[PDB]
Amino acid sequence: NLYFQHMKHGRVFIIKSYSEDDIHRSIKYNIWCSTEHGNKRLDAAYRSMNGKGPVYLLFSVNGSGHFCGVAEMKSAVDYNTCAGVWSQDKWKGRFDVRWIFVKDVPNSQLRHIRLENNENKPVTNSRDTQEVPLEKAKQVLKIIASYKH
């Protein structure tokens, strides 16, 4: 499997959700919204990528012990949208996503991948919109895709 070799235009972020309901809504309607500073990071990455490669999102519910799937950013952030569509009313705005994997991957499968841009911490100890260096992101995606147990 060498699909990901020679991929240079791609950026990958961790998405954390306190709410399982928000995960289910995102899957159903292919939309997401982050914090203000999270939206700004994702919007900048999406817009500067300019359709040259994907912005992937690695989703995990806080405290759950596993990742729950992978989606791709499919639009810029619209900051002025209906309020209160998520579990909490904190989030302002909306962007499109396309879910790629919906599958539980235990943190045990991924905790040995460490992020040089986050103090060598395990990728499983990231906060919302932590960016993942491309070479580590490829390793995470291969583990998520190949997981079956």
Ligand X SMILES: CNc1ncnc2c1ncn2C1CC1
96 lies in the binding site for ligand X (CB under 6 A): no
Site string for Cl ion, 101-140 (x = CB under 5 A): --------------------------xx------------
* Exposure b/e, 128-147, CB count within 10 A at least 16 = b: bbbbbebebbbbbbebbbeb
131 lies in the binding site for ligand X (CB under 6 A): no
Residue in 46, 56, 67, 91 binding ligand X, rule: CB under 6 A: 91
128 lies in the binding site for ligand X (CB under 6 A): yes
Q: Assess contact for 60 and 68: CB atoms under 8 A.
A: yes
Alpha-helix runs per DSSP H in the chain: 20-29, 36-49, 107-110, 134-146
Judged by beta carbon distances under 5 to 8 A according to partner kind, the member of Cl ion, ligand X, none in contact with residue 82 is Cl ion
Neighbours of 51 (CB within 10 A): 8
Q: In which region does residue 13 sit, left (phi positive, over 0), alpha (psi from -120 to 50) or beta (all else)?
A: beta
Judged by beta carbon distances under 5 to 8 A according to partner kind, the member of ligand X, Cl ion, none in contact with residue 12 is none
Least distance in angstroms from the C-beta of 2 to ligand X? 34
Residues that bind Cl ion (CB under 5 A): 16, 81-82, 127-128
